[PDB]
Protein backbone atom coordinates (compact mmCIF):
# COMPACT_ATOMS: atom_id res chain seq x y z
CA UNK A 1 0.00 0.00 0.00
CA UNK A 2 3.00 2.18 0.52
CA UNK A 3 4.26 3.84 -2.59
CA UNK A 4 7.77 5.17 -2.59
CA UNK A 5 10.47 6.41 -4.91
CA UNK A 6 13.02 3.76 -5.69
CA UNK A 7 16.30 4.91 -7.00
CA UNK A 8 18.42 2.23 -8.43
CA UNK A 9 21.80 3.57 -9.53
CA UNK A 10 20.30 6.88 -10.52
CA UNK A 11 17.28 5.33 -12.14
CA UNK A 12 14.31 6.31 -10.09
CA UNK A 13 10.89 4.83 -10.41
CA UNK A 14 7.94 4.92 -8.06
CA UNK A 15 6.83 1.56 -6.79
CA UNK A 16 4.03 0.53 -4.56
CA UNK A 17 5.01 -2.13 -2.15
CA UNK A 18 1.72 -3.25 -0.84
Whether 11 contacts 5, CB under 8 Å: no
d(Cα 5, Cα 16) in Å, to the nearest integer?
A: 9
Largest CA distance in the chain: 24
d(Cα 9, Cα 18) in Å, to the nearest integer?
A: 23
Segment holding 1, helix H or strand E? none
Whether 14 contacts 5, CB under 8 Å: yes
Task: State the method.
Answer: NMR
Tell me which residue of 16, 11, 13, 12 sits closest to 3, measured CA to CA.
Answer: 16
Amino acid sequence: KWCFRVCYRGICYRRCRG
